[PDB]
Design a protein around this ligand. Structure first.
Ligand SMILES: CCCCCCCC/C=C/CCCCCCCC(=O)OC[C@H](O)CO
Ligand SMILES: CCCCCCCC/C=C/CCCCCCCC(=O)OC[C@H](O)CO
Ligand SMILES: CCCCCCCC/C=C/CCCCCCCC(=O)OC[C@H](O)CO
Ligand SMILES: CCCCCCCC/C=C\CCCCCCCC(=O)OC[C@H](O)CO
Ligand SMILES: CCCCCCCC/C=C\CCCCCCCC(=O)OC[C@H](O)CO
Ligand SMILES: CCCCCCCC/C=C\CCCCCCCC(=O)OC[C@H](O)CO
Ligand SMILES: CCCCCCCC/C=C\CCCCCCCC(=O)OC[C@H](O)CO
Ligand SMILES: CCCCCCCC/C=C\CCCCCCCC(=O)OC[C@H](O)CO
Ligand SMILES: CCCCCCCC/C=C\CCCCCCCC(=O)OC[C@H](O)CO
Ligand SMILES: CCCCCCCC/C=C\CCCCCCCC(=O)OC[C@H](O)CO
Ligand SMILES: CCCCCCCC/C=C\CCCCCCCC(=O)OC[C@H](O)CO
Ligand SMILES: CCCCCCCC/C=C\CCCCCCCC(=O)OC[C@H](O)CO
Ligand SMILES: *C/C=C(C)/C=C/C=C(C)/C=C/C1=C(C)CCCC1(C)C
Ligand SMILES: *C/C=C(C)/C=C/C=C(C)/C=C/C1=C(C)CCCC1(C)C
Ligand SMILES: *C/C=C(C)/C=C/C=C(C)/C=C/C1=C(C)CCCC1(C)C
Lengths: 230, 230, 230
């Protein structure tokens, strides 16, 4: 393809596809109802990402947005992916710690605001206003990270030790990886335009595969996803 | 801004923002799991409205629709707000009366039809057909109001007296305020065009703040949102 | 109207409308909470389809997509219908057999991928790539049909005999009817273009009414939707 970033979109498609197939085969035969929930959530995540990476590779998930006096290539398909995959990742963490329903609704709702405002920012034609939406989205992200540390960590330590241990690892992975996304957006083609689109696409591919397939490998190898039984 | 209705969009943004912050601080420290559910639902409502009012203020949430031989300004962001906030408001009422799952699904589904058909009507280019969609949406609204009076009132009176009392007030607020929306649409810029857009925008701002922040102030001050405990 | 397929859109609108009204009246007075769930899910299905058939009849739900060097009429409103009605139909089947939550999430998620990739395929401007999306969507469909036969049939036979019996019939109806959709798409205006749009529209109308109103008549006449009580 004639876009230099094609190679990273192709690799991302392949890695999300391979991760989906691996999780699908690994979950074959699992009969524990708690483990089935985690396999279902965790396999859906790279499956959705696979479809949206493929849409970017083939050019469907790209649009041109005028701002700063240029026509700027915006990959809108990222937001369609993240709208569904980021609440699913949060549901994996919430189910692990048996979070109450009100906390789950708060997290999923804040996450929806985060991604939706990011999408508005990405498509906004007045340059200075793009950063207003970025700030609102980032505030929603900070709310999510606060709950994961000062609601979820406190509950986990009261549960089975393998649940506490696996939650603590996946919480730390999540906070580090998710915090990089607003930074890549700010310095890349959607924001200040300091990093070119080809490098930005590489960075999001590394983050996405780590936050989805890496995350899932840790979770689905854990004893924490099974009920305690004899 | 050069649009006369800007002042009402600005005030609406500010009031939804202030209401979100108030509910967020008030819900700090609440540990009762039932109360947490109500705080989460009720704080999300003005937070979503805040983002969509801001999108209208900055001009993102506006499009031009040709009908009647003119280019007509249609604020489409209202429907994106209401798609999520109106089912959340109904969930507050349904949880208060411990409604059965089938009734909740009926209400949320009718509400989705109401808002979705309103959006189609708002974007329809053949003038006479706009009113066909308005009629279908209004029928869905009447179904909702019927359930709130002839399903929900009957259940409430069988529950704790503080639940019955708070439900009856919030039901009455809801029926009065929600019934005004189809009337404003019909006589305003989306419909017959008798009331100008600046006044229409004022009317929806008053209704929205009352139906979201007013509603939430009544609910979150009530004893009904807490479990009965010693 | 000047489109030859109008007659089938009109008939489909009428039949979905009549089926909605019939199910609404039949469900009046039902007080069993399990039966209420099934009436709510099953009445919503033709109600949503009614609105989307009407949008196609009036011309709102149609767009033109260039591919193969022509402007091709694509009825996009079908996908908006199916996005909501196909998971509702699967929920009817899953509730009947008391499926576990993980299996329900797998089914609904695969169904979302099926319809979303179908929509991307329908709107794709590069002709050969339309069939890549068709293949991905069809793979998701095959996953769904596998679960209905090799997860759901095995559970049903362990339940009440009237539940097993009604599930087996509705499963067979579902597999036969749903399998025809990818074939109609492939040979019709969205795909290879061998069957003209007027005949394609007839075929989808027959399938839709059978898969929604036919399905619902079988289910809502069954004893299986009521709890076992004295
Ligand atoms: C997990 C095991 C594998 C670990 C792998 C980690 C990779 C993640 C980071 C990649 C950034 C690469 C940056 C590449 C920078 C090239 C940009 C460039 O060409 O910049 C020069 C320009 O011409 C003038 O400034
Ligand atoms: C809660 C405590 C505060 C209560 C506040 C309630 C306000 C709600 C209603 C406002 C309608 C105002 C209508 C303003 C009409 C002005 C339109 C106008 O200018 O019309 C004249 C025109 O030039 C030729 O007909
Ligand atoms: C339930 C009881 C009622 C059962 C009813 C079942 C109907 C379903 C199938 C219809 C296909 C009809 C196909 C009509 C074909 C006409 C196309 C045509 O005109 O093709 C000739 C063309 O001019 C040169 O090839
Ligand atoms: C001027 C101020 C403007 C408005 C501020 C920016 C709005 C968007 C940002 C963040 C979303 C905040 C989180 C929304 C969800 C809160 C849920 C909540 O309150 O949950 C309580 C529950 O007890 C928990 O377990
Ligand atoms: C419990 C459930 C909670 C759910 C919480 C969800 C909150 C989402 C809020 C705001 C983002 C809205 C974003 C809307 C973006 C639409 C952009 C679009 O499609 O624009 C069309 C065109 O490109 C230009 O007119
Ligand atoms: C806890 C997780 C938080 C995650 C969110 C952290 C956000 C703030 C980070 C960086 C902003 C630094 C300033 C970037 C703006 C630079 C503007 C500019 O003009 O830069 C010129 C350029 O450096 C040469 O050409
Ligand atoms: C010609 C007729 C055309 C069709 C009519 C217009 C369709 C749209 C209008 C209203 C939605 C109706 C409500 C949809 C949901 C009904 C749910 C239901 O039946 O719920 C039963 C349950 O027992 C409860 O607890
Ligand atoms: C339990 C879950 C129940 C959920 C019930 C939901 C029912 C929604 C039904 C119909 C409205 C569909 C509205 C679709 C509007 C799309 C308009 C649009 O985006 O148009 C694009 C462009 O502007 C022009 O081609
Ligand atoms: C229970 C809640 C129900 C809520 C829904 C109630 C709907 C009917 C209300 C009003 C319609 C009145 C007729 C409006 C149409 C007027 C058309 C016209 O030409 O008006 C000329 C104008 O009055 C001078 O220029
Ligand atoms: C190169 C390969 C590319 C990727 C493949 C194509 C992706 C889209 C197709 C099918 C969706 C598959 C189903 C997605 C949901 C799986 C859910 C699951 O694993 O559920 C386990 C649970 O135990 C159950 O009860
Ligand atoms: C538990 C919840 C699981 C939910 C699982 C859902 C999976 C959906 C995945 C992919 C399809 C995405 C389709 C996006 C299509 C948007 C097309 C569009 O609107 O295009 C705009 C314009 O026409 C051109 O730029
Ligand atoms: C279990 C359910 C599975 C459902 C899915 C089954 C998919 C495969 C079916 C048919 C493809 C047959 C080939 C169609 C392609 C024909 C291409 C062509 O050029 O046809 C010329 C035409 O026949 C004269 O003009
Ligand atoms: C699978 C993909 C993941 C986990 C993606 C996560 C994305 C975010 C945390 C995005 C956050 C953003 C902001 C906080 C500000 C605006 C830009 C966004 C959407 C990139
Ligand atoms: C927070 C906002 C609220 C509670 C908005 C409520 C909106 C409605 C009840 C809208 C109803 C409409 C009709 C019944 C007919 C068509 C026009 C609509 C969407 C305005
Ligand atoms: C009420 C409508 C129903 C039950 C519609 C069902 C539709 C499908 C099973 C569609 C499947 C498709 C594929 C498997 C491939 C691509 C084309 C689709 C969307 C037609």
């Amino acid at each position: 393809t004639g876009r230099p970033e094609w190679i990273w979109l192709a690799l991302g498609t392949a890695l999300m596809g391979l991760g989906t197939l691996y999780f699908l085969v690994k979950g074959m035969g699992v009969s524990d109802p708690d483990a089935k929930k985690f396999y279902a959530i965790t396999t859906l995540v790279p499956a959705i990402a696979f479809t949206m990476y493929l849409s970017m590779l083939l050019g469907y998930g790209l649009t041109m947005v005028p701002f700063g006096g240029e026509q700027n290539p915006i990959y809108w398909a990222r937001y369609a992916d993240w709208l569904f995959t980021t609440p699913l990742l949060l549901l994996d963490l919430a189910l692990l710690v048996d979070a109450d329903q009100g906390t789950i609704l708060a997290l999923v709702g804040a996450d929806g605001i985060m991604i939706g405002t990011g999408l508005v920012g990405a498509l906004t034609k007045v340059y200075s206003y793009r950063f207003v939406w970025w700030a609102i989205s980032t505030a929603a992200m900070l709310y999510i990270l606060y709950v994961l540390f000062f609601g979820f960590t406190s509950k986990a330590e009261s549960m089975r030790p393998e649940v506490a241990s696996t939650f603590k690892v996946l919480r730390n992975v999540t906070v580090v990886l998710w915090s990089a996304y607003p930074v890549v957006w700010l310095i890349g083609s959607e924001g200040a335009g300091i990093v070119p689109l080809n490098i930005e696409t590489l960075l999001f591919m590394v983050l996405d595969v780590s936050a989805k397939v890496g995350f899932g490998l840790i979770l689905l190898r854990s004893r924490a996803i099974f009920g305690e039984a004899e």
